[PDB]
């Protein structure tokens, strides 16, 4: 069985500069990571799509994409976007963007650009905050600057469900 | 089932073009098409992918893309790439751009495109040649400029397979 894990972060690119470093670190510990992100800014062979091929798929020498049109009214369900991935080549699926979900979540605080503490609806799911300034809790707390430790806490969490 | 039909050719014969017209046509006849395309031409959360996310899938409201990296073995198994699509909203999958493959196939030709017809190979998988000119050979010879004419043939072809 394979797990999924959220990565909440308030306004401010950060988590992309963060994750940009946590991914490799995760490979480092032999973890094959998958990432299901959710945006708003909406995304080759584009025309051929607007022409009518709902599902288009471009393959190349290095990578292959798969597009799937849904002017239906959807595409928020994770569990489905999951089954879509080749999960036999994955160990952990990172989940960023989807708001209001019941999966393990890891916050992210970085003062200066933004507000002050206590801001963290510690859902009955959140399992650790990652600040750059100390602070209390009732759940793990990491230094949003030690990718290594973070990578390690994560790997830990995993093996303790698995 | 859920047939796979390919369009072979030569550079400069309007392969891409013909499909911009053929797609709509198939749609008009109630045929939902999926297009699988290859390009030795290397074709948005780019950082986290080359960073280590073998599979990044960017969701949205209108549609979603599952982008897979393959820095070892480039994917050339049509059967695989097809099994990656959601065939429950597709009745036909068009295959284009993969040199040397062996599926249902319609060849393209246009006098003057730097090749004479004798240079055409009608292999076990050729279901019809679509020229812009009569050619003396024994295989469904269709007019390449009559799309609706073409569409009908496909549609019929499909039925004989289902």
UniProtKB/Swiss-Prot annotation, chains A, B:
Protein name: Molybdopterin-guanine dinucleotide biosynthesis adapter protein
Induction context: Is expressed at very low levels under both aerobic and anaerobic growth conditions.
Pfam short name (any one): MobB
Quaternary state and interactors: Homodimer. Interacts with MobA, MogA and MoeA in vivo.
GO biological process, one term: Mo-molybdopterin cofactor biosynthetic process
Protein task: GTP-binding protein that is not required for the biosynthesis of Mo-molybdopterin guanine dinucleotide (Mo-MGD) cofactor, and not necessary for the formation of active molybdoenzymes using this form of molybdenum cofactor. May act as an adapter protein to achieve the efficient biosynthesis and utilization of MGD. Displays a weak intrinsic GTPase activity. Is also able to bind the nucleotides ATP, TTP and GDP, but with lower affinity than GTP.
Binding-site list for GTP: 12-16, 88-91
Top-level taxon: Bacteria
SUPFAM superfamilies: P-loop containing nucleoside triphosphate hydrolases
InterPro entries named among the record's database cross-references: MGD_biosynthesis_adapter, MobB_dom, P-loop_NTPase
């Amino acid at each position: 069985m394979i797990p999924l894990l959220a990565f909440a972060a308030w306004s401010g690119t950060g988590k992309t500069t963060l994750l940009k470093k946590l991914i490799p670190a995760l490979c480092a510990r032999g973890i094959r990571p998958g990432l299901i992100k959710h945006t708003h800014h909406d995304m080759d062979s584009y025309e051929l799509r607007k022409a009518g091929a709902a599902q288009t798929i471009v393959a190349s020498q290095q990578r292959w994409a798969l597009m799937t049109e849904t002017p239906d009214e959807e595409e928020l369900d994770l569990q489905f976007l999951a089954s879509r991935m080749d999960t036999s080549k994955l160990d952990l699926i990172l989940v960023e963007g989807f708001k209001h979900e019941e999966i393990a979540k890891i916050v992210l605080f970085r003062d200066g650009a933004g507000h002050r503490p206590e801001e963290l609806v510690i859902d009955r799911h959140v399992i650790a905050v990652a600040s750059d300034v100390p602070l209390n809790l009732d759940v793990a707390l990491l230094d949003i600057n030690d990718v290594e430790g973070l990578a390690d806490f994560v790997v830990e969490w995993m093996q303790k469900q698995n």
